[PDB]
Amino acid sequence: MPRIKTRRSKPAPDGFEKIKPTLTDFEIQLRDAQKDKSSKLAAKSNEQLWEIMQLHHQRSRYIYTLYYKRKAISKDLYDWLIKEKYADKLLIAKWRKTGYEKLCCLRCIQKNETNNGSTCICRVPRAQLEEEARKKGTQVSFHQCVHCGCRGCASTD
């Protein structure tokens, strides 16, 4: 139930030793991403925060494709990964919905964070953004979202 291997923590199920070297590589990158690399720019400081939301996403895509896509791990292992917080319970739960297949993170769909009642613009399909910028005669001005640096979560692209 915690992250720390406590005595109240339950020992791992069978298939965990096969996937443990993959999970440690995400784990040591999260230790190096939080390293307090002192960068004086605002554009670089949040860019380093964008690395953390990416690695938390990529660790959760991995456990997602193990269980729902390829069925490579048991349910008793998969529930143990959620209770030990190796995967995001609520983010995987959005990847099962139809429009939210390649979701950027849970924050980029919160309607209350934004000034409008809108999602983030990284939810918008790229071809829709190309069409609106084409009428204006300019290139599309969006590059990376301010919350976690996404470049498009829309399931069509």
């Binding site: 990416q54 996403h57 390649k102 950027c104 990284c122 790229r126 071809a127 590059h143 640096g149 996404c150 470049r151 498009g152 979560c153 069509t156 692209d157």
Partner: peptide, 23 residues
């Protein structure tokens, strides 16, 4: 846009996505 086109245009991205860059 067609599904074969959108399958092709998503392979233009340098990464796999969602952090793959159109630039």
């Amino acid at each position: 846009f067609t599904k074969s086109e959108l399958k092709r245009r998503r392979k233009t991205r340098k990464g796999d996505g969602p952090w793959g860059s159109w630039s």
